[PDB]
Amino acid sequence: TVHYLKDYQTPAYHILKTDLHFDINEPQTVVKSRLTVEPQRVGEPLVLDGSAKLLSVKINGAAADYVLEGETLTIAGVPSERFTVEVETEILPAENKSLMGLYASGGNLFTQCEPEGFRKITFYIDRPDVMSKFTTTIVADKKRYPVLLSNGNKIDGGEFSDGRHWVKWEDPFSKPSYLFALVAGDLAVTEDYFTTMSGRNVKIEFYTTEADKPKVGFAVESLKNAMKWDETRFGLEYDLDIFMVVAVGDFNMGAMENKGLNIFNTKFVLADSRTATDTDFEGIESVVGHEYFHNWTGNRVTCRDWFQLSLKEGLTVFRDQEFSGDRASRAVRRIENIRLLRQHQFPEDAGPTAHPVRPASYEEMNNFYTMTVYEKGAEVVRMYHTLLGEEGFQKGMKLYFQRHDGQAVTCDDFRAAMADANGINLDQFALWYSQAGTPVLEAEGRLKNNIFELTVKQTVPPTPDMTDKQPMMIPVKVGLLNRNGEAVAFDYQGKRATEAVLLLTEAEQTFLLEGVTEAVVPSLLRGFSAPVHLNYPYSDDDLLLLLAHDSDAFTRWEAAQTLYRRAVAANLATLSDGVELPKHEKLLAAVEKVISDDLLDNAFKALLLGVPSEAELWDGAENIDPLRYHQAREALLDTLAVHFLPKWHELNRQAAKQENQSYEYSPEAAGWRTLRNVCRAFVLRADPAHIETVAEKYGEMAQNMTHEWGILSAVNGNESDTRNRLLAQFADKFSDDALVMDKYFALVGSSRRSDTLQQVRTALQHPKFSLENPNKARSLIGSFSRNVPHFHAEDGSGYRFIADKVIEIDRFNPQVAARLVQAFNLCNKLEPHRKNLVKQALQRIRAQEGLSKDVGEIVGKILD
Ligand SMILES: [Zn+2]
């Protein structure tokens, strides 16, 4: 079974009111629904999705005539006018290892419903264009489950004489079933509040374990920031007087925006400086913001169908990005998002699972919570902002809400709202949603006369879903530098400025930048104005100039990225020839300039000193030997490490001074620590023996987790026994903190040491490891699958190990398994020896009886 966007049809039935009663016992939970159903197409059979154990079904208080086959319950004889359906289901939440539906975690109960987990609770029209008003009653043992939560306002509750108690929750906003949530547990609460701009207090409650409560303060501060920001930046106010956040350690996603009752992975909720890195704090601030931003972009306006996922995800990611950039370090953060997209989304678009931002089909919708839908989705939203500017973007947002508040709509609708509010034609912009693959821009420039003439071609490769790719609407932001690197003004079109957005809409166009009175090197795709590959013929000196003198963060960073890539290309050549490594004189000059430049933002400096990953390096290659790319990248890194050894120590010391013993999170102190950790990595590459000095002063240096993490990352590939000793000590020190234990397993899995496979196999049996925990599985096994020299070992050991775990995990958590199996996505592009072994691994996975639809869809994309 495949679902096709072209087959969309409005539902035959609407659900007006959904009344739910939960009776929680050991081990069984019994769910009783009362659905108020309104016929849209009278006389059609009523079709309900559901997979929980079915105990009874009634239409109007009388047992229904029905058939249940697979996960579809059908009632043929339904009234022609409003009627009720009552379903009784029974759940065993402690047996739910999929972490979808109602499930146990740490002795408490939690739900995850998006996209299709609610049908695992009760039989329902489980699709997002069906919106209903939910009221939830919950009965449970008071001592075991003192905390009983669902969406909305708590309107009643009481006690029973037998030790049980109940609550009743009313969510007055119509919602799709994927936004339902329930929590039952023995949990601690942290209370705070926000007062909206119209003067309404909103009580804030974060629920955690009793032990995790001291780590929740930063998330609370982040939420309040997010709430104020949505008001100041978007004019958006919260709509209830209560907002709850519940942390859970067993969770497949990062977090979930269920109305007024968000449920979060602990990793995006808990921090203190002793146990969490600066990046962890940054993540909490983004995701806390993200989920709150969904209250409007996803909840108040939702998705007509799951093909439209990016309507809420692309828009909400853009929102969280803008929130984080407005907080601090806009340019550095933009670069980080760009780097992420290029390192993870670009390979997706170049591979067998590539898809449009709005897919035309899917077998399993869990497989589409993807870098493309989220991050490329955000780049697509950002292009509206680039084309329209802030005021125009905000006009679009206002009309979007005016038109669609209370509706389940499509990407077309958001486009139309942006188009209409600004009096502009964005018909061609629709191809950003329907065409997969990364566009390639072929660029050439000429200064003839006083005119700089930039010619630009575009194509987009076929992808497995679609061969035909038409020209797209691509904004190219540009500037021009003279031979001393300063800004050169130009005319276009009628305006005299130092920067312009060139709107490419045709297969090929020439842009005339007129009135140019000096020799120029152009700066192109400024701010990463469109998510594309751009090829302009730059010389090494052109790149050095851009890197030294350009006013744009992205274009400066891109020039360094290009220099590193050419260096690695030059290493690949000499290593293939069996000759000495290249000298890299110009690159080393450029890097010296960066190390020694004190006008550079610390965190921006750190990015400029980062070398593109192996996947970036083999982008566009065939017959890839991943170990040859690894060796070449490693060589470059070691050359940089050794060449500038005493200068890495010096930068390290300069950063230490400037951090000034300010160990708590702040974006300012974080910038210096980021730089410090880059220097640490280089130092330990050049002088592995420095590990014993580090070990001797470890306590002294371990002033927060950013430092411990940065030290341990720096020494992680070191073949000294001291590296194993430091890891063991870390595990012992933080044995009681599950989120720090995640870091430990990530270090185990990610190590470039020769013995990583056997240490990973030992780690499977560590008392703190749990295969059934998504954070643990990803930390250990996920990191191994990404560990280039080990995953792609020539003997196939890495492929067999990962396939073994995809098989084993898929027996309880298809979502974790389907993500993990994508480590094999490079298959077709590998050299023949490895390719053969990968295809064997995937065939073996395919041969498993009972293989999930999730993993089967991916394997089929890679294999067939
Ligand atoms: Zn989201």
mmCIF file of N, CA and C and ligand atoms in Angstrom, residues 255 257 290-291 294 312-313 316-317 374, ligand 1:
data_model
loop_
_atom_site.group_PDB
_atom_site.id
_atom_site.type_symbol
_atom_site.label_atom_id
_atom_site.label_comp_id
_atom_site.label_asym_id
_atom_site.label_seq_id
_atom_site.Cartn_x
_atom_site.Cartn_y
_atom_site.Cartn_z
ATOM 1 N N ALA A 255 10.871 16.354 20.231
ATOM 2 C CA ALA A 255 9.807 16.986 21.033
ATOM 3 C C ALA A 255 8.532 17.080 20.191
ATOM 4 N N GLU A 257 4.562 19.088 19.783
ATOM 5 C CA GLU A 257 3.807 20.314 20.051
ATOM 6 C C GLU A 257 2.342 20.153 20.469
ATOM 7 N N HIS A 290 10.718 26.294 19.031
ATOM 8 C CA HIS A 290 10.057 25.463 18.004
ATOM 9 C C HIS A 290 8.670 24.976 18.423
ATOM 10 N N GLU A 291 8.573 24.211 19.510
ATOM 11 C CA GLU A 291 7.291 23.595 19.885
ATOM 12 C C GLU A 291 6.215 24.617 20.254
ATOM 13 N N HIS A 294 4.822 26.197 17.078
ATOM 14 C CA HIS A 294 3.797 25.288 16.490
ATOM 15 C C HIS A 294 2.385 25.607 16.951
ATOM 16 N N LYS A 312 3.794 22.952 8.187
ATOM 17 C CA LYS A 312 4.076 23.265 9.596
ATOM 18 C C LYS A 312 5.560 23.128 9.971
ATOM 19 N N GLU A 313 6.258 22.111 9.458
ATOM 20 C CA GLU A 313 7.657 21.869 9.872
ATOM 21 C C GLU A 313 8.659 22.844 9.272
ATOM 22 N N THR A 316 7.878 26.150 10.909
ATOM 23 C CA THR A 316 8.226 26.240 12.352
ATOM 24 C C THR A 316 9.760 26.210 12.561
ATOM 25 N N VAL A 317 10.476 25.472 11.706
ATOM 26 C CA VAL A 317 11.945 25.503 11.764
ATOM 27 C C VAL A 317 12.461 26.914 11.450
ATOM 28 N N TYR A 374 12.053 19.336 6.838
ATOM 29 C CA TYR A 374 12.274 20.259 7.944
ATOM 30 C C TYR A 374 13.219 21.362 7.531
HETATM 31 ZN ZN ZN B 1 8.039 20.680 14.485
#
